[PDB]
Amino acid sequence: GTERRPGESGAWKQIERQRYASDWENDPTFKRTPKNLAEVLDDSASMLLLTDVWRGMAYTLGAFFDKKVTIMYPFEKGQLSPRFRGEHALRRYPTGEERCIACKLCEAICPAQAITIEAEEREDGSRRTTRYDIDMTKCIYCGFCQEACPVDAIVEGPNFEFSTETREELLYDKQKLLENGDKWETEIATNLRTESLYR
Amino acid sequence: AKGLEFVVSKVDNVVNWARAGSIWPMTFGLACCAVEMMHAGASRYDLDRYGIIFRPSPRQSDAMIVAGTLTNKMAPALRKVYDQMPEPKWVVSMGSCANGGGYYHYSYAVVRGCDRVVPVDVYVPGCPPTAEGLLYGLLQLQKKIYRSKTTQIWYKK
Amino acid sequence: SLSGYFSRLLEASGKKSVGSFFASWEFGKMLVDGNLAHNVLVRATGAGRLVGTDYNGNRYYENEEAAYGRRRWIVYKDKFDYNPTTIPPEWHGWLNYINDYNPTNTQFKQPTYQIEASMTKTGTQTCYNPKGSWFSAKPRNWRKYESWTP
Amino acid sequence: MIVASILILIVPVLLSVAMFTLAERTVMASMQRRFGPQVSGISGLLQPFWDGLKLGVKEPVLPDSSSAGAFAASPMISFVLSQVAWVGICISDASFQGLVIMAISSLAVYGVMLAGWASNSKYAFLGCLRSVALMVSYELSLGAALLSIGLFVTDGTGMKCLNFAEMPTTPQYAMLPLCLIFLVCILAETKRDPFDLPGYNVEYSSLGFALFFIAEYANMAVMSAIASIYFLGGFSALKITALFFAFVWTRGTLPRYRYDQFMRLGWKAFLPLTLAFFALHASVAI
Amino acid sequence: GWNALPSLVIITGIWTAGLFALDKVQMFRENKPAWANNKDGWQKALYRRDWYLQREEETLAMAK
Amino acid sequence: AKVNNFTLNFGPQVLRLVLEMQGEIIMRADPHIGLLHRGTEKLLEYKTYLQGLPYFDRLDYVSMMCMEHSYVLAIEQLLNVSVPLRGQYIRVLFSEITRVLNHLLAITCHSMDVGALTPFLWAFEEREKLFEFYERVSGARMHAAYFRVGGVSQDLPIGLLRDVYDWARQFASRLDEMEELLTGNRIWKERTVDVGTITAQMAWDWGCSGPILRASGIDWDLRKTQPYDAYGKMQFNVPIAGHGDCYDRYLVRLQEMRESLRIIYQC
Amino acid sequence: RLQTKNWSFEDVHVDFPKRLAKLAAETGQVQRLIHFSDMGADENHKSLRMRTKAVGDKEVLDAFPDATIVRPGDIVGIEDHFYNYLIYQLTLTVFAPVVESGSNKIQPTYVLDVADAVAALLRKPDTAGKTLYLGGPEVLTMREVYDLLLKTLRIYRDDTVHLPAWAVKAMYKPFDSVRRMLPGLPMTSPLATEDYVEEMLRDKVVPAGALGYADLGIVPQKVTDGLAIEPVRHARVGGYRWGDMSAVAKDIPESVRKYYNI
Amino acid sequence: YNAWSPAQRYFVEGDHVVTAEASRTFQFTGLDSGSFYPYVIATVIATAISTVFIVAPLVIAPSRVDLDKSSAYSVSFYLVSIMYLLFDIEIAYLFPYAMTHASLPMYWTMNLFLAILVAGFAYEWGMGALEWRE
Numbered sequence A: 001g002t003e004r005r006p007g008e009s010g011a012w013k014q015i016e017r018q019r020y021a022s023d024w025e026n027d028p029t030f031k032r033t034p035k036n037l038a039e040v041l042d043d044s045a046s047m048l049l050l051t052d053v054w055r056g057m058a059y060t061l062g063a064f065f066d067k068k069v070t071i072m073y074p075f076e077k078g079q080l081s082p083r084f085r086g087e088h089a090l091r092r093y094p095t096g097e098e099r100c101i102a103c104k105l106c107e108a109i110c111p112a113q114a115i116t117i118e119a120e121e122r123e124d125g126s127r128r129t130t131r132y133d134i135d136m137t138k139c140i141y142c143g144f145c146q147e148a149c150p151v152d153a154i155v156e157g158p159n160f161e162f163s164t165e166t167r168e169e170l171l172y173d174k175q176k177l178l179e180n181g182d183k184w185e186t187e188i189a190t191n192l193r194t195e196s197l198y199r
Numbered sequence B: 001a002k003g004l005e006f007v008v009s010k011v012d013n014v015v016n017w018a019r020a021g022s023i024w025p026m027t028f029g030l031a032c033c034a035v036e037m038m039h040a041g042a043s044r045y046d047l048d049r050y051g052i053i054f055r056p057s058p059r060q061s062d063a064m065i066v067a068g069t070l071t072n073k074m075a076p077a078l079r080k081v082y083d084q085m086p087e088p089k090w091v092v093s094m095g096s097c098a099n100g101g102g103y104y105h106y107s108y109a110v111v112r113g114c115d116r117v118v119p120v121d122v123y124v125p126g127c128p129p130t131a132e133g134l135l136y137g138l139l140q141l142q143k144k145i146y147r148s149k150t151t152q153i154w155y156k157k
Numbered sequence C: 001s002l003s004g005y006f007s008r009l010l011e012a013s014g015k016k017s018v019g020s021f022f023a024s025w026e027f028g029k030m031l032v033d034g035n036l037a038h039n040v041l042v043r044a045t046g047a048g049r050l051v052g053t054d055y056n057g058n059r060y061y062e063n064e065e066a067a068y069g070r071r072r073w074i075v076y077k078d079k080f081d082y083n084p085t086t087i088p089p090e091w092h093g094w095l096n097y098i099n100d101y102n103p104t105n106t107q108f109k110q111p112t113y114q115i116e117a118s119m120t121k122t123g124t125q126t127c128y129n130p131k132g133s134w135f136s137a138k139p140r141n142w143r144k145y146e147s148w149t150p
Numbered sequence D: 001m002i003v004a005s006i007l008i009l010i011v012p013v014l015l016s017v018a019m020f021t022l023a024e025r026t027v028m029a030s031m032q033r034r035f036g037p038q039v040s041g042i043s044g045l046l047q048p049f050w051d052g053l054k055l056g057v058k059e060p061v062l063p064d065s066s067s068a069g070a071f072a073a074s075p076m077i078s079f080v081l082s083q084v085a086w087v088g089i090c091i092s093d094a095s096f097q098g099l100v101i102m103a104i105s106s107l108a109v110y111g112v113m114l115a116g117w118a119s120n121s122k123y124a125f126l127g128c129l130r131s132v133a134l135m136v137s138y139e140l141s142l143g144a145a146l147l148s149i150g151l152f153v154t155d156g157t158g159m160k161c162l163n164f165a166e167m168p169t170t171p172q173y174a175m176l177p178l179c180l181i182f183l184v185c186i187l188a189e190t191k192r193d194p195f196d197l198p199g200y201n202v203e204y205s206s207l208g209f210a211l212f213f214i215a216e217y218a219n220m221a222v223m224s225a226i227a228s229i230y231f232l233g234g235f236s237a238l239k240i241t242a243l244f245f246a247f248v249w250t251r252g253t254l255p256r257y258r259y260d261q262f263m264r265l266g267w268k269a270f271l272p273l274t275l276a277f278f279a280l281h282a283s284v285a286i
Numbered sequence E: 001g002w003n004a005l006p007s008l009v010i011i012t013g014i015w016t017a018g019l020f021a022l023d024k025v026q027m028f029r030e031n032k033p034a035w036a037n038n039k040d041g042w043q044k045a046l047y048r049r050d051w052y053l054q055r056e057e058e059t060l061a062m063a064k
Numbered sequence F: 001a002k003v004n005n006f007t008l009n010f011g012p013q014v015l016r017l018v019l020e021m022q023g024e025i026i027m028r029a030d031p032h033i034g035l036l037h038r039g040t041e042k043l044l045e046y047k048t049y050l051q052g053l054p055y056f057d058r059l060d061y062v063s064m065m066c067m068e069h070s071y072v073l074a075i076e077q078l079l080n081v082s083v084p085l086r087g088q089y090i091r092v093l094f095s096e097i098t099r100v101l102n103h104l105l106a107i108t109c110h111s112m113d114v115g116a117l118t119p120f121l122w123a124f125e126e127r128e129k130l131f132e133f134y135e136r137v138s139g140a141r142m143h144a145a146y147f148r149v150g151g152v153s154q155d156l157p158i159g160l161l162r163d164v165y166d167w168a169r170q171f172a173s174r175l176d177e178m179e180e181l182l183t184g185n186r187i188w189k190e191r192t193v194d195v196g197t198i199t200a201q202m203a204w205d206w207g208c209s210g211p212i213l214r215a216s217g218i219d220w221d222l223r224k225t226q227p228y229d230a231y232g233k234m235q236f237n238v239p240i241a242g243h244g245d246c247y248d249r250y251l252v253r254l255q256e257m258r259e260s261l262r263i264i265y266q267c
Numbered sequence G: 001r002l003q004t005k006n007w008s009f010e011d012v013h014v015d016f017p018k019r020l021a022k023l024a025a026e027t028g029q030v031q032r033l034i035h036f037s038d039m040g041a042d043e044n045h046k047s048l049r050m051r052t053k054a055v056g057d058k059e060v061l062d063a064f065p066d067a068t069i070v071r072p073g074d075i076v077g078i079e080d081h082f083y084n085y086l087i088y089q090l091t092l093t094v095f096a097p098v099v100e101s102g103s104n105k106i107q108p109t110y111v112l113d114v115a116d117a118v119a120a121l122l123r124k125p126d127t128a129g130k131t132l133y134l135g136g137p138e139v140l141t142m143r144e145v146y147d148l149l150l151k152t153l154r155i156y157r158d159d160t161v162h163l164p165a166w167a168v169k170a171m172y173k174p175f176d177s178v179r180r181m182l183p184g185l186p187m188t189s190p191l192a193t194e195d196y197v198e199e200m201l202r203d204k205v206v207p208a209g210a211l212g213y214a215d216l217g218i219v220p221q222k223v224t225d226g227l228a229i230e231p232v233r234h235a236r237v238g239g240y241r242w243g244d245m246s247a248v249a250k251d252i253p254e255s256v257r258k259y260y261n262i
Numbered sequence H: 001y002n003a004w005s006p007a008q009r010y011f012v013e014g015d016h017v018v019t020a021e022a023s024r025t026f027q028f029t030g031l032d033s034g035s036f037y038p039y040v041i042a043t044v045i046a047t048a049i050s051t052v053f054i055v056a057p058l059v060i061a062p063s064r065v066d067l068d069k070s071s072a073y074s075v076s077f078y079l080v081s082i083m084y085l086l087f088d089i090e091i092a093y094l095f096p097y098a099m100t101h102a103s104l105p106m107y108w109t110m111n112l113f114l115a116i117l118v119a120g121f122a123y124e125w126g127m128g129a130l131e132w133r134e
């Protein structure tokens, strides 16, 4: 219970105040003085012989005999959604041509300035990138680049397990991002078949 | 010669099994990433299941997890606490802020990566990384500890 | 039935007999790795059914009477160096509870450029490196102009 | 034969200390709806051994501003006193065995105070005095409890003693409140919850630290055996496990006191209660 | 939980086996299952007399 | 006598404190801050309004969408933008989910600092459930960037309200089993009762707000006095205590979790 | 510094520098080869390591003709092998042997000055093919070094004893005939060998007319006092510490004295 | 210890008793009742074990020299220590009482002893000396 007692007061000014004045008897949140013998025995069985520790002990012993919420990683996984923002990746058309057309919108929206793009025209006249870098140690994983892209070229895929031993392994260039897309293409397409109803 | 080299290789196997299965890290809960590290220690992921005990003092610490951004005001304190850990020790950089400055990379007050102050063994990416991603990074650090061969190197000196 | 337990143990471990199972190095690592020990000996031998197998050899199981978020699990074929980066993307969303699709009930569209999933190469010298790195076949000087050579 | 008996005693003490610290982790985990150590060996059964071997190949930090001898001597003194107290439990026939173990446990204060004097930390000096004050304050209630216990311990020839083999083999139902006070005094001596506010081994690494924790868990086992002898009708394996489970159970479910709070508890509650119970039992024993 | 059962069983088994072995060793040393009893001055006098008379019986046996 | 103060340095490891004591009694406390000052106010001048929005998730990173809310409302007022009804309801619902997450962490971290370890481990699994609710609508467990100028970023996926109702159906039981370990326990009371008392005049003079202000007997809730989005339609109570205690703040925070559950059910 | 059953002095000081100089000259793009040897290196030295070092210097200058040979004295630093073993000899031992009168002269130098010397060599093209001797601005004897360490450590009991060289070699002989057939043991001093005794019977200074720090434009730092002696001041009895700090705190402001509790 | 006189050996003559005593096994039921000798051997053995624990990481562990690794990371105690001293002396006095089968005048003498104890203790309680506010 939330009731107070003279003596259980954590400080000194209130401890000095409760033992020299009866101002605590006016306050309604205090427990009143016992009036007869049975109330004195109830108060003493509260203070001595504990019984407030025992309720918490009974609860924790019930929890000892209860079910557990631990998953056995990496044999068992957690739960995520198709909107999950993981490792960045670059995508292709089903023919095998890149979707990206070097519009530089994802580079403009990036609040971390984690994208660096250079481009010129390809030998068949197409508008394609020559450099597409993502500093993964500068990235904030917001997904704004995914929102800004008008051709669904850059995505954040469903991969979260990509920790490395050197920091140079986390400065992605264009070739590695295309390799990530070629790895994760079927899962990305399955996710985007649901998330295109909302976006 | 063949027998003693076999014994020395098994001494490395047992020592690496002990050191990877008894990592006691030190918490630098600087920022956002500390909450995901708390979630890693909680009942769902249970870092204590893998032998990980968080320790308050650097003298009993086997590893350092930098979980959050490092400022210019905090860098000498982090360096001093790193220097007080005994060998062998490892450093795990967690999240974009500790990895490379992250979202505060162009600020007047932030160290662009904890690499610039301490050497780092395993980098975990994200802002924040999930607790499960931090488990992946710690299992990778265990894999790095497994490939060490200390008594074999000492035997051939 | 203990015969059911041993049949489940042999189909999960991939061995041919209990003598071949207990005399293997996989059982030797299961004496020193308890995570693998629990996964093979308790979870894979319990209530549940086999769903499918990927091209890396990992087996996938499910149990609908379990708690939520503990219904699905994997038995890795690599017993000594098991890693979640060997799970193909057509099993990744099933095992991470993102969708309810796997190859046993869904025909995925396979692009002609698809690279199969394999274990990570970090920590070795065959990892990814940028083009200006020392470990590249030919390091780049990224100058944006041409110098005059007499 | 004495050296052989002592080594055959020493082996299960250290094996039991390793298994106690594992069982504390796992029972504390099960109360919190998780698992605890399972990966490190099958069912996690190698985790204390890999902790010990990890600390074995760990670098010993010897600070070059302290006195090296007292710094080395403090965990050695703690460990030696724990082992000697176990020998007094099992390889003695003395008349005042409980007084012997009380004298040994009164010596255990020195490791804390030598660690406080040796290491040049500002708050190690601050916390060692608090921990010593707590142990010193609850030793008196332990002594008065021993006075109440010894009023009824008589051997066959009629001599009153504190010999453990002469203690009765039935639980002492007449001394239930004194048993509860004894258990909370054990909790206070081992600096466990709810008295874990003071730490003193902040500068120790590797096997000096390991010696500190082996001494702490062995002292907990000593006090558990003493309580089972005095109140539970004998020393047994089941009683050791049950009392350890009770201590971990209390550590799972309770918060800790402030320094002045447990000082007021030990000097205004436990000491007058044990002395009043001694006077009542002396009145009964006439 | 089920994970806490093996360590708690092992503590009991360790203490049971260790106490059994220590009991057998000290029983071999003392040859009577009351060596740990309290002894006063009369009982100490009786044991010391018994030891010396046993030595005397051994000395007198190697003379016939 | 002429007793000088004994001073103490309290933790580089991100609060630094310089105390002064006259024995066992503190006479002064001076917090030294700026160990996490990353200059986000300067960096926001170099961003567009959409670019600078994810800075706000990283201010109070226990309560993210509530930090987003005020920045979005400030932009919307100057733009003279109206938010549609469903977006206002979604904003209120996720603001209350955010408040539940923050209060779970605050109470259990407080009780762990005092010494009780189990309520932390009990409450963080509920925190994991609410993180799954964040991730299913934004793809991020913490830094959602969900609230935007004029509404929210995406619609609610089909099947979210079903699961939020299934969590809210058992959350009161979780809060109940949380209070069995702390509320009627004498050690927690002896640590918290009459510690750090704040009166109303000191609360307003020192710019206080939130559950501190309600534990000193002040009826002031911004969701009832200056309402925003659809908070004026919501029916809930303001909890009031009158000692200004740590214990009273703990009770007010638990009741505020109950009231947030009530608003969640109404939404 | 010590021989092992897997590695001898010729393998490290002779064979590897020769093959390194050959493979360096094979590439064609290596413009500079900086090889490090010792100040006391001499082909007519009784100590084996000095002799193998001088032989390898000759092989390096033969195979790579523009390689620079650098010969510094004793190098002081936080992780050095000069003051650290001397402090481990003054403490942690019952007695510290000193070879003869301890009147052999040395010229110790600071590690940061050697690091600056490498960059100054890489700047100056004339230093290719030369040999440089790196020594500090003070010439000291071993007795003076021991006295400086005993004064700096604040030890009030001289535990050193001066011994004839045959007695020191007789002490170090049992742990030198067993140095092979052993993989190398931790905490073995490099001063517990006969080669150190032979080095102590000779001067190790900069020769007259040699190229030194001054030809590189470097004024070397003092080794006996200043920043170089600060690490050994941390190992004194009790601790480094400031002092009473009250004579100068007289006109210090208000919050500072209370902050330091003065 | 070995007996040095015929009276100490119960007047048993010969040389077999002298050698048999000097080479005897320790026995609590022979010549070594209540002996406290295993307490010394336990101290020696445990000191050996803890010394081996101290010395071993100086051989088989890595080590690096650093100047920062070798650096640092009320009157109520007087009350407690002196009060504990006096109360421990009083409990030591009370222990010979509890080890006797005491008669009634012994009981009343002991209660006078305890009364003087608790009167001084209650005076220090009433003057507010067991309130550890400072």
Ligand SMILES: COC1=C(OC)C(=O)C(C/C=C(\C)CC/C=C(\C)CC/C=C(\C)CC/C=C(\C)CCC=C(C)C)=C(C)C1=O
Pocket (backbone or CB within 6 Å): B053, D014, D015, D017, D018, D021, D022, D024, D025, D047, D048, D049, D051, D052, D210, D213, D214
């Ligand atoms: C929350 O509480 C806890 C802590 O915080 C207070 C801890 O710190 C630790 C971690 C610390 C540990 C385990 C150190 C103390 C125990 C040790 C060193 C184990 C002692 C075991 C021994 C001596 C037997 C092992 C040796 C053998 C078998 C010999 C091997 C020999 C050969 C193979 C030849 C734990 C587990 C813990 O729960």
Ligand code: SF4
Pocket (backbone or CB within 6 Å): A088, A109, A110, A111, A112, A113, A114, A115, A134, A138, A139, A140, A141, A142, A143, A144, A145, A146, A156
């Ligand atoms: S997710 Fe955010 S930080 Fe990463 S590239 Fe896209 S906009 Fe930049």
Ligand code: SF4
Pocket (backbone or CB within 6 Å): A099, A100, A101, A102, A103, A104, A105, A106, A107, A117, A148, A149, A150, A151, A152, A153, A154
């Ligand atoms: S990835 Fe998309 S937004 Fe970025 S440059 Fe290419 S087409 Fe434009």
Ligand code: SF4
Pocket (backbone or CB within 6 Å): B031, B032, B033, B034, B067, B068, B069, B094, B095, B096, B097, B098, B102, B103, B126, B127, B128, B129, F058, F061
């Ligand atoms: S990386 Fe992101 S989540 Fe982690 S501390 Fe920095 S801003 Fe917070």
